[PDB]
Design a protein around this nucleic acid. Sequence first.
DNA 1: TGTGGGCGTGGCACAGGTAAAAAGGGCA
DNA 2: TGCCCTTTTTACCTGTGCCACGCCCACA
Length: 277
Amino acid sequence: PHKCKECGKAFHTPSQLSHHQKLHVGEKPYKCQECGKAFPSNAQLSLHHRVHTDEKCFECKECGKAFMRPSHLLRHQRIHTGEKPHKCKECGKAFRYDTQLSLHLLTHAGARRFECKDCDKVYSCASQLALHQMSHTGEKPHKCKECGKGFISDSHLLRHQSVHTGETPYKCKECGKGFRRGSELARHQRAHSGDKPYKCKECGKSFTCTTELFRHQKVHTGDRPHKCKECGKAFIRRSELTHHERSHSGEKPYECKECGKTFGRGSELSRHQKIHT
DNA sequence: TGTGGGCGTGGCACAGGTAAAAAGGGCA
DNA sequence: TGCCCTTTTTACCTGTGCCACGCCCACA
Ligand SMILES: [Zn+2]
Ligand SMILES: [Zn+2]
Ligand SMILES: [Zn+2]
Ligand SMILES: [Zn+2]
Ligand SMILES: [Zn+2]
Ligand SMILES: [Zn+2]
Ligand SMILES: [Zn+2]
Ligand SMILES: [Zn+2]
Ligand SMILES: [Zn+2]
C-alpha cells in the first residue's frame, strides 16, 4: 500500500501496487545482460555496463550508471540530490552545473560573449558557437549509411534509423502496442488514463500531447500559413492547401472502386467505402 | 425524413529541428 | 583527476499524414 517510485499514484494494496508497476516496464527496453538492470536508452545502458567491464569506474548506486573519475560521478549525482552548488555572484541564482552558470552569466555585464554573426544568439564559449553555426552552414556530418541524409550528431542519425528499421521498442503493457519513443508510449499511457495535462487557456479542452494542444490553439490565434496564390484562402495545414488546390483544378485523386465515385480527400473514400462494409 | 458528401478540425504515432542537460576530456 | 570548456545525448519544439469525427447543406 505505497506510492509508486515512478508515478506516485497511490496504489494501496501491496499486490495492487506490484500489479501497478507491471505497467511501467515497457518504458525501459534496454536490459543489462549481467544484472538485468533496465534503462530507457541504449546509451544509458552503456554507462551502466561499464561496471561489468572496467575495473577503474565509479558507479552511482542510485541509478547504476558509472563514470571514469569521481568528480564525474559527484556531478551526476546532483540529478538525484537536487543540489545546486554553482551560484551567480551577481544575483545569487544557483545552478546544478558550472555549464549552466556560465550561460547565465551572459545576462550580466562583463562576461565574455561569443556572438553569432548571422542571428542574435550569443554563447558562453567557442565550442557552443561553432555548434550553432552549423545550422547556418547546413552541415550535417553523420550520414545515414542507408538514407544518405545527414544529421548533426550520431545520436540523431541513430534516432532517425527508426525509418530504416520500423522497430518499436517501447511497449504498453495494457494494450500491447509498441512505440518508437518513450515519449509517445508515455502519451499513449496518458490516453488510457485520460490524463490530459495540457489544457487550453481559451477553450478549456485538454490534451495528452504537447503537439495536439498547439495545433488546436491555431484557431483562436488565427495562425494560418499556406495561403492560396489563386483565391487567397488561408489554411492551417500544408495538407489543407493540397486539398483545396485540387478543388480549383477539379482534381479528384481518390475515387471508389465500387462507387466509381470520386472525392478530393481520402477521409471520405474511407467514410463511403464503409457502405459496402 | 433521409443520405451523404464537403469540410474544418480532433486523435494519433511520427520525423527532424534547435535548446538544453549531461557526460567527456585537455591541461597541469 | 578536478577545473572548466568540449562533445555527446536528451528534452523541448514544430510541423506532418492518415484516419476519424460531427456539423452543414444540396438534394434523393
Ligand atoms: Zn507508477
Ligand atoms: Zn548490469
Ligand atoms: Zn545516478
Ligand atoms: Zn546564428
Ligand atoms: Zn536515412
Ligand atoms: Zn495501451
Ligand atoms: Zn482552444
Ligand atoms: Zn484557392
Ligand atoms: Zn463504393
